[PDB]
Amino acid sequence: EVQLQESGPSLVKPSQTLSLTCSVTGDSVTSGYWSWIRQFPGNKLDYMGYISYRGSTYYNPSLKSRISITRDTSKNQVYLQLKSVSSEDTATYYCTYFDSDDYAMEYWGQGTSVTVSGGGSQIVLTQSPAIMSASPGEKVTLTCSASSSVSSSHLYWYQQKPGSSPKLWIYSTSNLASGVPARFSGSGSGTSYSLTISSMEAEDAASYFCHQWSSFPFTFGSGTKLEIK
């Protein structure tokens, strides 16, 4: 019901400015946040910042002073500007929409790839093993250990398959999002969380990322790639 689409140059020279546009289409909204999230090669996700429905912004401390997120509401667009890029800014950039009156839904654009030729603190989310293979029919358990405590309402899981964006999979530790087979489950508390498939199917092979938005900047685990034997 909200579609999102990112565009801008696929290549940028060091020290230049990167400018992307997120085109919002679909139903009108009365609240929420448009966030820019990027994914590095090797798949680490990085929360950049948001602009709210009231035009309030939050920027990852790591980017502050380089980043700005703006809106052209007449054009239903949201913009990202990041100045003084380096090869460290090479990634696929996604814009996303979320409304905290509803924890169960989050919308992601298709994502656009960009290649380049503060002071703060963050919760680190650890997912081990990085890669795992299971046979069809096995009960599978993936874990997420947070370096500091996280509210269980704000611990979330995402599935992603090659060539496509992360999809909201579990929200608030244990609730399956729309689209998710009920063979999935999640539990945990404090700094220790797990996702479970009662019975592994071929379609479950994918990367899974955990995510907390209990503390600012929100962070993602580096994922477990789940393969089929």
Positions that interact with ligand B40 (CB under 6 A): 33, 35, 50, 98, 100, 106, 156, 213, 218
CA nearest 177: which of 165, 186, 169, 187?
Answer: 169
Residue 94 or 184: the one with the smaller Cβ distance to ligand B40 is 94
Q: What is the C-alpha to C-alpha distance for residues 224 and 204, in angstroms, rounded to an integer?
A: 12
Residue 144 or 200: the one with the smaller Cβ distance to ligand B40 is 144
State the minimum distance, in angstroms, from the CB of residue 6 to ligand B40: 16
Residue 208 or 218: the one with the smaller Cβ distance to ligand B40 is 218
State the minimum distance, in angstroms, from the CB of residue 5 to ligand B40: 18
State the minimum distance, in angstroms, from the CB of residue 74 to ligand B40: 23
Residue 50 or 79: the one with the smaller Cβ distance to ligand B40 is 50
State the minimum distance, in angstroms, from the CB of residue 171 to ligand B40: 7
State the minimum distance, in angstroms, from the CB of residue 98 to ligand B40: 4
Residue 33 or 184: the one with the smaller Cβ distance to ligand B40 is 33
